[PDB]
Design a protein around this ligand. Structure first.
Ligand SMILES: *[C@@H]1O[C@H](CO[C@@H]2O[C@@H](C)[C@@H](O)[C@@H](O)[C@@H]2O)[C@@H](O[C@@H]2O[C@H](CO)[C@@H](O[C@@H]3O[C@H](CO)[C@@H](O)[C@H](O[C@H]4O[C@H](CO)[C@@H](O)[C@H](O)[C@@H]4O)[C@@H]3O)[C@H](O)[C@H]2NC(C)=O)[C@H](O)[C@H]1NC(C)=O
Ligand SMILES: *[C@@H]1O[C@H](CO)[C@@H](O[C@@H]2O[C@H](CO)[C@@H](O[C@@H]3O[C@H](CO)[C@@H](O)[C@H](O)[C@@H]3O)[C@H](O)[C@H]2NC(C)=O)[C@H](O)[C@H]1NC(C)=O
Ligand SMILES: *[C@@H]1O[C@H](CO)[C@@H](O[C@@H]2O[C@H](CO)[C@@H](O[C@@H]3O[C@H](CO)[C@@H](O)[C@H](O)[C@@H]3O)[C@H](O)[C@H]2NC(C)=O)[C@H](O)[C@H]1NC(C)=O
Ligand SMILES: *[C@@H]1O[C@H](CO)[C@@H](O[C@@H]2O[C@H](CO)[C@@H](O[C@@H]3O[C@H](CO)[C@@H](O)[C@H](O)[C@@H]3O)[C@H](O)[C@H]2NC(C)=O)[C@H](O)[C@H]1NC(C)=O
Ligand SMILES: *[C@@H]1O[C@H](CO)[C@@H](O[C@@H]2O[C@H](CO)[C@@H](O[C@@H]3O[C@H](CO)[C@@H](O)[C@H](O)[C@@H]3O)[C@H](O)[C@H]2NC(C)=O)[C@H](O)[C@H]1NC(C)=O
Ligand SMILES: *[C@@H]1O[C@H](CO)[C@@H](O[C@@H]2O[C@H](CO)[C@@H](O)[C@H](O)[C@H]2NC(C)=O)[C@H](O)[C@H]1NC(C)=O
Lengths: 48, 71, 22
């Protein structure tokens, strides 16, 4: 979301996802431990 | 995350950054590096799950006081 | 408080301090 406020700041997509998970009230360790499952679910949803 | 003693440390509120030689933890909107200690981070799991984890040392604030206590 | 319950709360510093002394 940085590019929405000022100059775009690069950040790895996994880190961005950790930020979003922390935003919805879920500890980022959940994502950092299930990253493969989250990525697979996202890809499957896009295919669907 | 950070690997310290076979455990995975994640920042409590902030991100881990590296200036080339050392690792610090800093808030996400204003660069003010802080030494990575047990207060800045929390442990979860081990080192065999996360992707991109890196070795480093996590300072224990209680350790110097305990050492003086032993002395 | 209504609904509170007995249970033990483990203090992380207690084992460190007690092990040092012992
Ligand atoms: C990456 O970051 C580390 C950490 O240093 C901190 O960040 C730097 C970017 C820079 O801003 C530093 O000013 C800042 O402290 C750099 O690694 C070095 O870390 C030491 C201690 O933190 C700094 O101290 C400096 O170098 C000597 C270290 O002993 C000494 O001449 C001076 O330190 C004084 O205080 C220490 C306190 O422990 C004491 O032990 C010393 O004896 C002395 O009194 C001096 O201030 C260094 O500035 C940091 N840099 C170097 C070359 O030593 C690292 O350099 C930095 N690398 C890059 C590319 O940014
Ligand atoms: C949490 O819920 C999700 C449901 O979306 C589960 O994700 C998927 O669950 C299935 C069930 O096993 C997994 O199937 C996999 O099949 C492959 C076939 O080769 C194999 O690797 C395993 O046999 C595995 O079971 C799937 O990997 C998994 N992830 C997907 C579909 O992307 C998830 O299992 C649940 N996690 C729990 C309950 O802890
Ligand atoms: C963070 O540090 C740990 C411990 O150093 C890293 O885990 C790896 O653990 C093994 C054994 O503890 C270290 O040596 C290994 O020996 C076995 C013997 O069979 C060998 O097969 C392995 O290839 C390895 O050499 C190993 O040094 C250590 N690896 C590293 C990079 O330190 C862990 O990898 C580190 N976390 C990272 C790199 O993200
Ligand atoms: C929800 O939790 C509270 C506990 O803080 C319940 O308070 C009830 O207060 C009575 C005292 O009048 C406690 O004693 C027992 O009451 C039952 C009737 O519920 C009675 O048959 C027994 O002989 C005994 O005197 C009672 O432990 C306690 N009831 C419960 C279920 O915990 C409150 O009633 C609870 N409400 C519900 C729907 O669970
Ligand atoms: C949590 O644990 C404590 C300790 O049991 C509970 O406090 C109450 O403490 C008294 C005495 O230690 C226990 O017996 C009571 O003695 C008084 C004075 O003789 C008497 O007037 C009472 O009728 C009772 O016999 C009492 O069992 C104990 N209460 C309970 C529920 O264990 C405290 O209440 C506990 N809190 C919860 C939510 O369980
Ligand atoms: C991001 O990509 C780079 C490149 O793949 C990774 O650094 C290593 O670079 C060598 C050669 O380019 C590759 O053979 C390795 O596969 C790369 N390692 C890994 C784990 O991919 C870098 O490590 C990657 N960073 C993360 C978090 O995966």
């Amino acid at each position: 979301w940085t590019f929405g406020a000022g100059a775009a700041l690069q950040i790895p997509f996994a880190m961005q996802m950790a930020y979003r998970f922390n935003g919805i009230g879920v500890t980022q360790n959940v994502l950092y431990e299930n990253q493969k499952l989250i990525a697979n679910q996202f890809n499957s949803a896009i295919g669907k | 995350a950070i690997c310290h003693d076979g455990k995975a440390h994640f920042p409590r509120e902030g991100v881990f950054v590296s200036n080339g030689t050392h690792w610090f933890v800093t808030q996400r909107n204003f660069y003010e590096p802080q030494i990575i200690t047990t207060d800045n981070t929390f442990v979860s799991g081990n080192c065999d799950v996360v992707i991109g984890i890196v070795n480093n040392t996590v300072y224990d604030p209680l350790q110097p006081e305990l050492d003086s206590f032993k002395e």
